Amino acid sequence: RIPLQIVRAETELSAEEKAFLNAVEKGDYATVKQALQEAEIYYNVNINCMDPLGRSALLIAIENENLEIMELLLNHSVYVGDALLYAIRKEVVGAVELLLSYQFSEFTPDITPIMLAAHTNNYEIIKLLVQKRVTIPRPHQIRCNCVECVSSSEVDSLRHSRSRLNIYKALASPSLIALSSEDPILTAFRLGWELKELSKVENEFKAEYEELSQQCKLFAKDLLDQARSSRELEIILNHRDDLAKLKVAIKYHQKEFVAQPNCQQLLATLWYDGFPGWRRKHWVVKLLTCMTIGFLFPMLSIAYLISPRSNLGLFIKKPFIKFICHTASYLTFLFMLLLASQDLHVQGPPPTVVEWMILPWVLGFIWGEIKEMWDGGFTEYIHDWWNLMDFAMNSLYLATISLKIVAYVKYNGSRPREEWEMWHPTLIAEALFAISNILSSLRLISLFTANSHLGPLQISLGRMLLDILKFLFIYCLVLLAFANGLNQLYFYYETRAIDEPNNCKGIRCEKQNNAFSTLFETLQSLFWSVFGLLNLYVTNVKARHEFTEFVGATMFGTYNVISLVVLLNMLIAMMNNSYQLIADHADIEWKFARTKLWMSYFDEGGTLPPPFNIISLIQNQHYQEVIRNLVKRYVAAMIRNTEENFKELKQDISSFRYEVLDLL
Amino acid sequence: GRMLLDILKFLFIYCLVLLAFANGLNQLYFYYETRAIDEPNNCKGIRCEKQNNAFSTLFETLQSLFWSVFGLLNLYVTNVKARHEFTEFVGATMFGTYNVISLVVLLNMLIAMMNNSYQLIADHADIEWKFARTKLWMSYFDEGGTLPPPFNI
Amino acid sequence: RIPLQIVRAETELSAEEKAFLNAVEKGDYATVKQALQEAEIYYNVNINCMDPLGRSALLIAIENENLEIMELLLNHSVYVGDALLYAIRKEVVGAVELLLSYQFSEFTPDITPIMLAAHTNNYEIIKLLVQKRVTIPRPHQIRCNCVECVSSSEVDSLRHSRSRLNIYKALASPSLIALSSEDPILTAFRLGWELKELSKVENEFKAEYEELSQQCKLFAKDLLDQARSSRELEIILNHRDDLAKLKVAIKYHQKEFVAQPNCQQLLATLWYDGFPGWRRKHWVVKLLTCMTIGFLFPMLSIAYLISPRSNLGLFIKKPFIKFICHTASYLTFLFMLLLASQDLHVQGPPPTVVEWMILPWVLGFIWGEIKEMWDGGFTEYIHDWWNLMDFAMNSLYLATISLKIVAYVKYNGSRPREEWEMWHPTLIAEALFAISNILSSLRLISLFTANSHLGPLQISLGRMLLDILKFLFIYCLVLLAFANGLNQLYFYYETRAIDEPNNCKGIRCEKQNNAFSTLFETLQSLFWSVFGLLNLYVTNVKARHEFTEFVGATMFGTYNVISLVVLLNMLIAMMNNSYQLIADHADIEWKFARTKLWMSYFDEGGTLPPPFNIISLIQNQHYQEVIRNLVKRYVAAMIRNTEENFKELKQDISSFRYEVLDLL
Amino acid sequence: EVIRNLVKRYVAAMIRNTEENFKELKQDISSFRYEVLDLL
Amino acid sequence: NYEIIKLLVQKRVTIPRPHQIRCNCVECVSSSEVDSLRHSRSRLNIYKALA
Ligand SMILES: CC(C)CCC[C@@H](C)[C@H]1CC[C@H]2[C@@H]3CC=C4C[C@@H](OC(=O)CCC(=O)O)CC[C@]4(C)[C@H]3CC[C@]12C
Ligand SMILES: CC(C)CCC[C@@H](C)[C@H]1CC[C@H]2[C@@H]3CC=C4C[C@@H](OC(=O)CCC(=O)O)CC[C@]4(C)[C@H]3CC[C@]12C
Ligand SMILES: [Ca+2]
Ligand SMILES: [Ca+2]
Ligand SMILES: [Zn+2]
Ligand SMILES: [Zn+2]
Ligand SMILES: [Zn+2]
């Protein structure tokens, strides 16, 4: 038998106090008034007594939305501490008004009335409290190192984090941004960015800051949604303190704001500047138009070079035409790259016709990269993540040019390639040019963003490359482990190349041999074993060491089971899970990426593709009027868009019953 | 670590099927076992350049069927010097049945098992990692074991 | 401009009729009574007038749960047709009572009050209507061919199917089975089975019959759940009209009823007859006990053979001990099968020691199979789906024995195997024995049901084999297509075996050749190409027919892309989808299969494993009392377990308001 | 005729098939309370 | 809402006809160039009403 008692005892109520609290709960005004008037004279009932749940008479009256009993208790001067917080959390406007006109707590000490109202996101109570001059303390820098911040963190790191989270919950309230904010959209953008940075910094409190940032982004998107005309939309997007605010939204990674259907419609209308009816056209018509504009890109470039002010000179400045011209230029460059591989004994030969036509494109690519670096800046250049591949391409092309020049000025004779040096400059130049061709042909992935059916796919692939990068670390660890083991076991039986059947040593011979004789060769053997191109007889030695052969073959089999069976299916499961997490947001991400791609063609700089590139207070008032209209519409829409309801209904019915019984 | 349990569950059935087919192929092929001297390079087994005697013994049959999962077992091992075409076809069809059961059925089945088991850990992955990392942190809170090897001796 | 009018016009109401209907809707009793009394004299208002929604005054009064206005309208003799159906569908007991005491329709003509009450599954109204002698028409046979059924189907196949579905919805009601049913559990079982058969037969109306059968199964499971003691449970399971009703539930595939935790507890208590505390034991203790009982299975079998009445004679009759003994016997059989492969030039040799010890096991297996066929019957034998593998094993073993006998009595000399005939009886016997060994070793899959961690897995694999069978048809179609094509292209260049390097022809040689020379060899080449064991040089001919070689290689590549890339990943997706559909029900399916496995060991027949096998009205009254208790408990539990509620609240408030205003 | 029957049946079936409800209930209760207090 | 829709259809009320999906009249292009947000919103509202 387990005895049950009250381990943490409290002060029980008397019979009269319990009767008074029950009368307050039932809403009987007459009995409560009589009890108060009698407590004034006899002092037999404590009006500030709690209940077994901790609520007092005032808290019970607030929870039941009984304004009459609330006012009756307030007129008798009951304890009122923290009652405003309970009235605000209950989201009852009349109670808040009555408390503005005049121990254990469910609210933390740092909670203030305005902060709690912002937490509740109730426009009425927030506006009530903002009518009075109320103020939220300013949060310090995300990485602030002042004496006050470190002192508060060392004294109490739980109180400090809780206070910061409460302040950022108050500031991130959509109703508190609709009011008391000069620019709600820019405030929402900055607040979302700062909350994302705090989520990055605060690891434990990450989900809350993430959801607050997402709430701010959704607030900005809904504010943009309330626009009802193109004039208002272009006033919003072009406000600067064109498309300045849209560029700011792109800077703060506001994907929901950018992917707005109206914003995307405006961007598409700007994108097809020359063609007014591109939206309603057949597939064959669009294909023929694109092919015709692409085949005429040198004519358009030359017309822009000669006279920019003409029917053909400024025709390339249109964003879609500019994109088509750049794509056609890159396609011709890749076609010449394909032609390049179509005497070969010359040591350091002069460049051929195809290479002489390739050189202008390489120079134009390098000049365009350095011009983008000089104009846009450094951070914008490194934020692209495609300028890395462009830098690799340009560096490899420059190395190819340098090695070609060196081999031309250091060699004159025509010696057959069979007796050339392994590190001959021509060979290194050819290898670097082949790698550069691979990279240049792979550079066409960035054009999948301009397509409707190839954009979300590319976004999904970019997002799934992160799971592959995560799996690559563990795969490489296992690979290094097994390579070290097999090398340690097999390096004793290394044989010279002359002893091999065809003077060939390694796994790239017809008969593979010395697969695990060195660390590098062991790494390559275990890499090629993933694809099955490593034969099983490589785990063999000429000596009759059957135990060593079996141990090596079993190491090989263990590596096969770990990589091909465990790691590969594990990576498949990882990618399968990661893809479903992008299925929903694929369209918004693609629209943001395509918006960036479109905005990249809106500038006057870089108009000519290679190789032709080497040859005012009314605004603020209009924006404020539009913002006022948007705020009104958004407040109305959000207003238009449990047991407490039934409890309020029961309280009303009981109060009406008691007053009818008293009247009759 | 949580997906290794599904692999351990699949390993039992895979090993049962492997033992079954190994016993069958051994029972069928152990009559045609040839000495190592008769082999082209005095090498007997599946680790030679020309694989031979792949199903001549239970151990060698197990290893041949293990390596057949990764495709490193050539098809001409299901051959005999005699003109027993029926026996050769029956052995090759046992081999093909084992291939279909393991590579096609069992492997995709294991993939589906791991795919289902991963989604069941997606939600609780953070809490499990935080518990494991808490244990790792508490392991370094003690005075014992302060000096790493070889300074501890 | 699109003009909008009333294409299907109706008869509009007058002002007085609309006012009367509005007074009925608002619940004002006085105005409605005055309107009725005035319509009696002046005949100015039609009391049977509809509304723009088709409802009359009586229907409006029923929908608002206004019993006073309902009775007032009934006393004035308003039209009452089909009002009982609306009162039943509304699930208002008082309205049904008032209508029992006394045009367009929302109910089909075949709907009757008792049928609609059964559809609503309302115990109160169903009992009300069953108090009166009410009757549901009997549905005919699922495959009935009488004149009435075919006549009704040919005259109106929509009315007939609807009537059948309504009748089966009425009969499958849990409340209508709680009442008016001698045995609710057996009725639920039979009804679920018949609804499943109808779902199989009625393809268009499949989901409805499936959900009705599932509802009946859940009703039976919940009736079993209401048991509160082991006595009641064993009374239910052992009722026969032991474990007779449990065997009936197993026969009707009642997986939810079988997998009941209490039923499974009783079955486990019966399963561990000898061990009372097997539930609370360590892993090592259970393992040692199982190993000890398995190593002593011949002693237990011999003790049962000599004296069944002893501490060891009847110790094997315990179900768990019997299962352990049979498993140990099969394990020893497989161990001897493994020993079997451990002079060989004898044509038709006599059996060795291992085969002489194997023969008793084979004879015992055959005798056990034929004894199961003779005892259980034919349908039960073919329902197992494992007796197919047992039949294959026994047929192959019998063929092995026959071929061994023939080779022994037809050959005496010792000729080396190299010069033996291709179809020598010894070779066929050895091949059949190897196939039999494969099948016998694969027979251990059926023992995974007895394990907790291996049972649901085996169920999932059995359920995923159906998707593989579905994919096999399309794979074989594509395989046959490409095999026919490659054969048609390549059969001209077939070369003799002597012309081959080692007198070897086919793909099983060291150098593969003639891979697509015949239909059979083409099928095998394309089969082995799935696993990559078919080399690429087989798509080559000695002649310089480069076009033919390229066309054949491209057929091969197309087949590779279709099978390995498309079909294989498609099958992976199929199995991945099919597995999640079994994840939820895996435990119940495993528990049903394990219950069947346990019940298989409850019989006296087949006690000895191979090779030792070849050497009363109180019951119904108790069951009825238990069933009455269960029905009461289930009705109470189901009773314990939208805009119409708010509409009823508003109607009550408005009626009270009007009556208060009239009184004052 | 068949289409008219179908339209009637569909309208009836669709008719047969939040805070504003509670607000309407509270409004009705408050109005009844005020009118009772005024009458008494 | 069937009741209110029928109420308003009792009076002769009329919804403007949407033009062709690929219409190229002067009115459509003028409305699209003047305000492409108001035009799309009006078309969507008309097609929500008709559907
Ligand atoms: C696929 C194999 C045969 C290699 C072919 C290389 C190129 C000829 C392909 C590869 C990627 C293709 C590009 C993928 C994406 C687009 C976007 C597309 O733009 C649109 O979708 C129209 C809508 C718009 O951009 O306004 C223009 C064609 C283009 C450049 C494609 C042109 C043809 C490209 C360059
Ligand atoms: C896995 C490789 C090495 C082949 C081994 C073959 C056998 C030695 C294995 C294969 C399947 C195993 C069986 C799988 C299932 C079970 C159920 C198990 O029963 C239980 O789970 C205890 C609970 C109960 O049955 O009451 C008894 C062991 C047994 C027969 C196992 C015994 C060992 C078996 C026969
Ligand atoms: Ca760039
Ligand atoms: Ca059987
Ligand atoms: Zn600070
Ligand atoms: Zn009939
Ligand atoms: Zn128009």
The CATH number given to whatever domain includes residue A38 is 1.25.40.20
Contact yes or no for A119/A166 (Cβ under 8 A): yes
Q: Phi/psi zone of residue A97: left (φ > 0), alpha (ψ -120 to 50 degrees), beta?
A: alpha
Token pair belonging to C423: 């179809």
Distances (CA, A) of A218 to A115, A174, A563, A629: 21, 9, 43, 18
Largest CA distance in chain E: 39
Residue of B nearest to C431 (CA): B28
Identity at C24, one-letter amino acid code: V
Does A91 carry a binding-site annotation? no
Across the interface, of A511, A532, A553, the residue whose CB is closest to B70 is: A532
DSSP state of C2: E
Q: Can chain E be said to touch chain A, i.e. do they have 3 or more Cβ pairs within 8 angstroms?
A: yes
Residue among C151, C323, C249, C353 nearest C592 (CA) = C249
Chains touching D (3+ CB pairs < 8 Å): A, C, E
Cβ distance of C417 and B31 shorter than 8 Å: yes
C140, C170 contact by CB (below 8 A): no
Distance C163 CA to ligand 6 centre (A): 13
Could you tell me the distance, in angstroms and rounded to a whole number, from the CA of residue A287 to the centre of ligand 1? 11
User: What distance in angstroms lies between residue A138's CA and the mean position of ligand 5's atoms?
Assistant: 10
Cα–Cα distance, C582 to C254 (Å, whole number): 17
Cα A554 from Cα A562, distance rounded (Å)? 12
SS3 for A11?
coil
Q: Please tell me what DSSP assigns to residue A179.
A: S
The CA-CA-CA angle for residues C47, C52, C55, to 5°, reads 50
Q: What is d(CA A132, CA A126) in angstroms, rounded to the nearest whole number?
A: 10
| H or E segment and range at residue E13 | strand E13-15
Helix or strand holding residue D7 (H, E): helix D2-16
Could you give the maximum distance between any two Cα atoms of chain B, in Å? Answer: 75
Q: Do C653 and D28 touch (CB under 8 A)?
A: yes
**Residues A613/A368, Cβ–Cβ less than 8 Å:** yes
User: What is the sign, positive or negative, of the torsion defined by CA atoms of B64, B70, B74, B80?
Assistant: positive
β-pairing, C2-4 with E13-15?
Answer: antiparallel
Q: Which two tokens stand for residue B14?
A: 């895979």
- Cβ C422 vs Cβ B80: under 8 Å: no
Distance of alpha carbon B82 from its chain centroid, rounded? 31
Q: What is the C-alpha separation between C489 and C538, in angstroms, rounded?
A: 13
Three-state DSSP at E15 gives: strand
Ligand 1: nearest atom to the Cα of A272: 26
Exposed, middle or buried: residue C409 (CB in 10 Å: 0-12, 13-18, 19+)? exposed
The token duo for C493 is 């260049």
CA gap A279, A293 in Å, rounded: 17
* Per-residue buried b or exposed e for A221-233, using 16+ beta carbons within 10 Å of the residue's own CB: bbbbbbbbbbebb
What atom in ligand 1 is closest to the CA of residue A327?
30
The H or E element spanning position C618 is helix C618-640
- The length of chain C in residues reads 664
Distance from the first to the final alpha carbon of chain B: 33
d(CA C319, CA C278): 14
What b/e sequence results for A324-348 when a residue is b if at least 16 CB atoms lie within 10 Å of its CB, and e otherwise?
bbbbbbbebbbeebeeeeeeeebbb
Around Cβ C361, how many Cβ atoms within 10 Å? 22
Other Cβ atoms within 10 Å of A83 Cβ, number: 21
- Scored b (16 or more CB within 10 A) or e, A288-306 reads ebeeebbebbeebbbbbee
Provide the 10 A C-beta neighbour count for residue A592: 22
Structure tokens at A295: 């085949």
Round to whole Å and give the CA distance between C441 and C439. 5
- From B46, B48, B122, residue closest to A577, measured CB to CB: B122
Q: How far apart are the first and last CA of chain E?
A: 13
Binding site annotation covers E42? no
Q: How far is D1 from chain A (nearest CA, A)?
A: 41
Q: Are B52 and B77 in contact (CB under 8 A)?
A: yes
**The pair of three-digit structure tokens given for residue C394, joined into one six-digit string:** 């026994």
- Minimal CA–CA distance to B52: which of B24, B33, B26, B71? B33
Query: C518 CB contacts (<8 Å, ≥6 apart)?
Result: C487, C491, C494
For residue A440, what are the β-bridge partners?
A: none
CB neighbours (10 Å) of residue A533? 12
Does an H or E element contain C4, and which?
Answer: strand C2-4
Closest alpha carbon to C522 in C538, C500, C511, C537: C538
**φ, ψ (nearest 5 deg) of residue E14:** -145, 135
Cβ of A334 below 6 Å from ligand 1: no
Closest partner residue to C3 (CB to CB) among E10, E12, E50 is: E12
Are C556 and C486 in contact by the 8 Å Cβ rule? The answer is yes
Pocket mutation for ligand 1, best pick of A451, A597, A598 (most atoms within 8 Å of C-beta): A451
Q: In terms of DSSP H, where are the helices of A531-567? A: 546-560
Q: Which two tokens stand for residue C635?
A: 């009705």
Residue of D nearest to E2 (CA): D11
- With tokens 């076991």, the residue in question is A489
CA dihedral C108→C112→C114→C118, nearest 10 degrees, is: -10
DSSP, res E14: E
DSSP label at residue B82: S
DSSP code at position C419: G
Which ranges of chain B would DSSP assign to H, the alpha helix?
Answer: 3-29, 58-69, 85-99, 107-122, 125-138
Where would I find the H helices in A377-454? 379-382, 387-410, 425-442
A543 near A493, Cβ under 8 Å? yes
E33 among annotated binding-site residues: no
Distance from CA of E26 to the nearest CA of C (A): 18
Q: Long-range contacts made by residues C231-234, C-beta under 8 angstroms, separation at least 24? A: C232/C626, C232/C629, C232/C630, C233/C262, C233/C263, C233/C266, C234/C266
CA angle A275, A278, A280 (to 5 degrees): 145
- The Cα-based distances of A347 to A351, A420, A433, C648 in angstroms read 12, 9, 16, 99
Asked if E43 and E36 count as a contact pair (C-beta separation under 8 A), the reply is: no
Rounded CA separation A45/A20 (Å): 8
Using a threshold of 3 CB pairs under 8 A, tell whether chains E and B touch: no
Is A140 within any annotated ligand binding site?
yes
Q: How far apart are CA A449 and CA A455, in angstroms?
A: 4
Q: Minimal Cα–Cα distance from C2 to chain E, Å? A: 5
In the block, tokens 């000669």 appear at A306
**Share in percent of chain E as helix, strand, coil (round to 5):** 65, 5, 30
* Residue A450 Cβ < 6 Å to ligand 1: yes
The pair phi, psi for residue A133, each rounded to 5°, is -70, 95
Cα distance from C111 to chain D (closest Cα, Å)? 16
Provide the token pair at C56. Answer: 């009359």
Cα–Cα distances in angstroms (integers) from residue C614 to residues A554, B98, C108, C306, C370, in the given order = 46, 34, 66, 14, 12
Per DSSP, what are the bridge partners of residue A513? A506
Distances (CA, A) of C623 to A548, A640, C191, C632: 73, 60, 20, 14
Alpha-carbon separation of residue D26 from A59, A150, A646, A659, D30 (angstroms): 21, 53, 10, 17, 6
Nearest chain E residue to C51 by CA distance is E3
CA distances from C192 to C237, C253, C380 (A): 18, 9, 20
Of C512, C531, C521, nearest in space to B98 by CA? C531
Neighbour-count burial of E11, counting CB atoms closer than 10 A to its CB (0-12 exposed, 13-18 middle, 19+ buried) = exposed
State CA E27 to chain mean position distance.
Answer: 14
Atom of ligand 2 nearest to the CA of C448: 15
**Residue-range definition of the domain harbouring residue A125:** 15-269
**Distance separating alpha carbons of residues C274 and C315, to the nearest angstrom:** 8
**How would you classify residue C346: left for phi > 0, otherwise alpha for psi between -120 and 50, otherwise beta?**
beta
Q: Which two tokens stand for residue A216?
A: 């701010």
What's the length of chain A?
Answer: 664
- Rounded Cα distance between B55 and B77, Å, is 8
Binding-site residues of C: 140, 144, 146, 149, 369, 372, 387, 390
Q: Contact, A192 vs A220, CB < 8 A?
A: yes
- Which residues in A lie closer than 8 A to residue D33 (C-beta atoms)? 652, 656, 659
Report CA-CA distances (Å) from A605 to A242, A325, A600, A613.
Answer: 15, 14, 10, 10
- Could you give the count of Cα atoms lying within 13 Å of C337 in the half-sphere of its Cβ? 28
Residue with tokens 């809780």: A162
State the closest ligand 2 atom to the C-alpha of C271, by its place in the atom list counted from 1: 26
Selecting from A511, A557, A569 the residue whose C-beta is nearest the C-beta of B114 gives: A569
- The 3 state secondary structure assigned to A215-271 is HHHHHHHHHHHCCCCHHHHHHHHCCCCCCHHHHHHHHCCCHHHHCCHHHHHHHHHHH
E5 CA to chain A: closest CA distance, Å? 22
> Could you give phi then psi for residue C361, rounded to 5 degrees?
-65, -40
Phi–psi pair at A311, nearest 5 degrees = -65, -25
Q: How far apart are CA A600 and CA A170, in angstroms?
A: 37
Alpha carbons within 13 A on the beta-carbon side of C39: 18
Are B7 and A574 inside 8 Å of each other by CB? no
What method did the depositors use to determine the structure?
cryo-EM
Cβ count near C243 (within 10 Å): 19
Distance, in angstroms, between E5 CA and closest chain D CA? 12
Query: Which residues, 6+ apart, have CB-to-CB distance to C205 below 8 Å?
Result: C161, C165, C199
Please state the φ and ψ torsions of residue A279, each to the nearest 5 degrees.
-65, -40
Q: Are C396 and C403 in contact (CB under 8 A)?
A: no
Check CB contact under 8 Å for A269 and E36: yes
Per-residue CA distances from A125 to A97, A112, A113, A178, A582 (Å): 9, 13, 10, 13, 39
Position D17: which residue type? N
- Residue A320 near ligand 1, beta carbon < 6 Å: yes
**Is residue A311 a known part of a binding site?**
no
State both tokens at A114: 């305005």
Who's near B142: CB < 8 A, 6+ residues apart?
Answer: none
Q: Do E50 and C5 touch (CB under 8 A)?
A: no
Nearest CA in chain D to C53: D12
CA distances from A216 to C439, C463, C660 (A): 66, 48, 52
Would residue B45 be called left, alpha or beta, if left means φ above 0 and alpha means ψ between -120 and 50 degrees? left
Residues in chain D: 40
Indicate which ligand has the atom closest to the C-alpha of E27: 7
Distance from C-alpha of A493 to C-alpha of C34, rounded to nearest angstrom: 115
Ligand 2 within 6 A of C450 CB? yes
Contact between residue C258 and residue C595 where contact means Cβ atoms under 8 Å apart: yes
Residue C43 CB: number of other CB atoms within 10 A?
A: 8
Please list the residues that pair with C2 across neighbouring strands.
E15
User: Which burial class, exposed, middle or buried, applies to A562 when counting CB atoms under 10 A from its CB (0-12, 13-18, 19+)?
Assistant: middle
**CA–CA distance, A194 with A622 (Å, rounded to integer):** 28
Q: Which tokens is A399 given?
A: 């190395």
Which parts of C are annotated binding residues for Ca(2+)?
369, 372, 387, 390
- Do D and B touch, 3+ Cβ pairs within 8 Å? The answer is no
CA of E20 to the centre of ligand 7 (A): 6
The verdict on whether omega for the bond into residue A137 sits within 30 degrees of 0, i.e. cis, is no
According to DSSP, the residues that pair with E14 across neighbouring strands are C3
C-alpha pair distances (Å), C569 with each of A2, C474, C599? 61, 14, 41
Q: What is the rounded distance in angstroms from the CA atom of residue C16 to the CA atom of residue A595?
A: 64
Breaks in chain B after residues (C–N exceeding 2.5 Å): none
Residue C401 to residue C355: CA distance in whole angstroms: 10
Nearest beta carbon to residue C341 from set B19, B26, B71: B26
Element (H, E) at C3: strand C2-4
Q: Can you tell me the distance from the alpha carbon of A143 to that of D29, in angstroms, rounded to the nearest whole number?
A: 56
Mutate to test the interface with A, among E19, E22, E33, E36 (most CBs of A within 10 A): E36
In chain D, what's the furthest Cα-to-Cα distance?
58
Q: What is the largest CA-CA distance in chain A?
A: 126
Count of helices and strands (H, E) across chain E: 3, 1
In 3D space, the residue among C458, C348, C345, C443 whose CA is nearest the CA of residue C396 turns out to be: C443
- Helix, strand or coil, per DSSP, at residue E25: coil
| Residue A578 amino acid letter | S
Q: For residue A388, how many other CB atoms are within 10 A of its CB?
A: 10
* Alpha helix positions (H), C7-78: 15-26, 29-42, 57-63, 67-75
- What is the resolution in angstroms? 3.0
Backbone dihedral angles phi then psi of residue C4, each to the nearest 5 degrees: -120, 125
Q: How far is CA B50 from CA A208, B39, B47, B75, C486, in A?
A: 64, 9, 8, 11, 29
